[PDB]
Amino acid sequence: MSEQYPVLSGAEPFYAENGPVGVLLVHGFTGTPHSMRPLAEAYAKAGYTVCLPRLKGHGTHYEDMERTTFHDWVASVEEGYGWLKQRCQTIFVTGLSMGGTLTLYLAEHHPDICGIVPINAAVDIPAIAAGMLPRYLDSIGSDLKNPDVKELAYEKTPTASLLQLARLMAQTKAKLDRIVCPALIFVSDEDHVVPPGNADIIFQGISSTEKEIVRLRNSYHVATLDYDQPMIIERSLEFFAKHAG
Ligand SMILES: *[P@](=O)(CCCN=[N+]=[N-])OCCCCCCCCCCCC
């Protein structure tokens, strides 16, 4: 039931103990903490306590991922949330792609979360249903506008894992109205992976009175590492300070 392969260089989780306000950062499907690290480091430098976990079956080998279910990915996030609760009075959650899905999921099950920052979060990806063949699909290159960036992601995607994601997304979509905390929803106009309309499914679905969509015009899907990174960091910091206890 445990991972059989070692953690890849660059895929290590990140923890920083600072003040009583904490931020949980969640990476995406087939990705690793690498996707979120620049944000995590910026938030720690600003005085936040920070938790950037490595999702089970991620950052090792796609064969480990194939052996996980979405419950394992939820468990990794719950564990990180729990780490923060032991240290913080105020907790924010942010995440990219499926990390954004998991951000929404955690807020749907924990009303104490003080605010969320989903980034190109996924609750409906029609491409999965369309395709739903081989045991592993060749991964397409990382969707970044800046070609110089090196993202860390599995070279193959187990198709069985796509079914797990679809289940997680379906459950998350169904429960959106449980979210009442403030929300800052980032979306890349030119996301070629997660259809940008997901931003509006989320905006309309949640019950929050304080919510907004910020469109990113200079990034593709992996916006946390792309040209609009500085803006994501700056606006996220403003959001944390505004809503912190
Ligand atoms: P995010 O967590 C990360 C996207 C970048 N990495 N990748 N992969 O979104 C995960 C879901 C992406 C959409 C998957 C569509 C696959 C369609 C293939 C159809 C085969 C049945």
Residue numbers in the entry: 1 to 132, 138 to 250
Task: Give verbatim lines from the article.
Two molecules of bMGL were in the asymmetric unit, and both had the C12 ligand covalently bound in the active site; clear electron density for the entire ligand was observed in both chains. The bMGL·C12 complex structure shows the cap region in an open conformation similar to conformation I. Electron densities for residues Thr-133–Glu-137 in the cap region are absent in the C12 complex structure, similar to the free form of bMGL and the bMGL·PMSF complex (root mean square deviation of all Cα atoms, 0.13 and 0.14 Å, respectively). Representative of these contacts, the side chains of residues from both the α/β-hydrolase core and the cap region, including Phe-29, Ile-125, Ile-128, Leu-142, Leu-167, Leu-170, Met-174, and Val-198, form hydrophobic contacts with the alkyl chain of the C12-ligand bound at the active site in the bMGL-C12 complex. The backbone NH groups of Phe-29 and Met-98 form hydrogen bonds with the O2 oxygen atom of the phosphonate group of the C12 ligand, highlighting that these residues form the oxyanion hole during the course of MG hydrolysis. We synthesized p-nitrophenol esters of alkyl phosphonic acids and used them as substrate analogs with different alkyl chain lengths. The irreversibly and covalently bound ligand is captured in the bMGL·C12, bMGL·C14, and bMGL·C16 complex structures (distance between Ser-OG and the phosphorus atom, 1.6 Å) mimicking the tetrahedral intermediate of carboxylic acid ester hydrolysis.
Here, we present a comprehensive study of five crystal structures of MGL from Bacillus sp. H257 in its free form and in complex with different substrate analogs and the natural substrate 1-lauroylglycerol. Crystallographic studies of MGLs have resulted in the determination of three-dimensional structures of human MGL (hMGL) and its ortholog from a moderately thermophilic soil bacterium Bacillus sp. Both MGLs possess the expected α/β-hydrolase core domain harboring a catalytic triad.
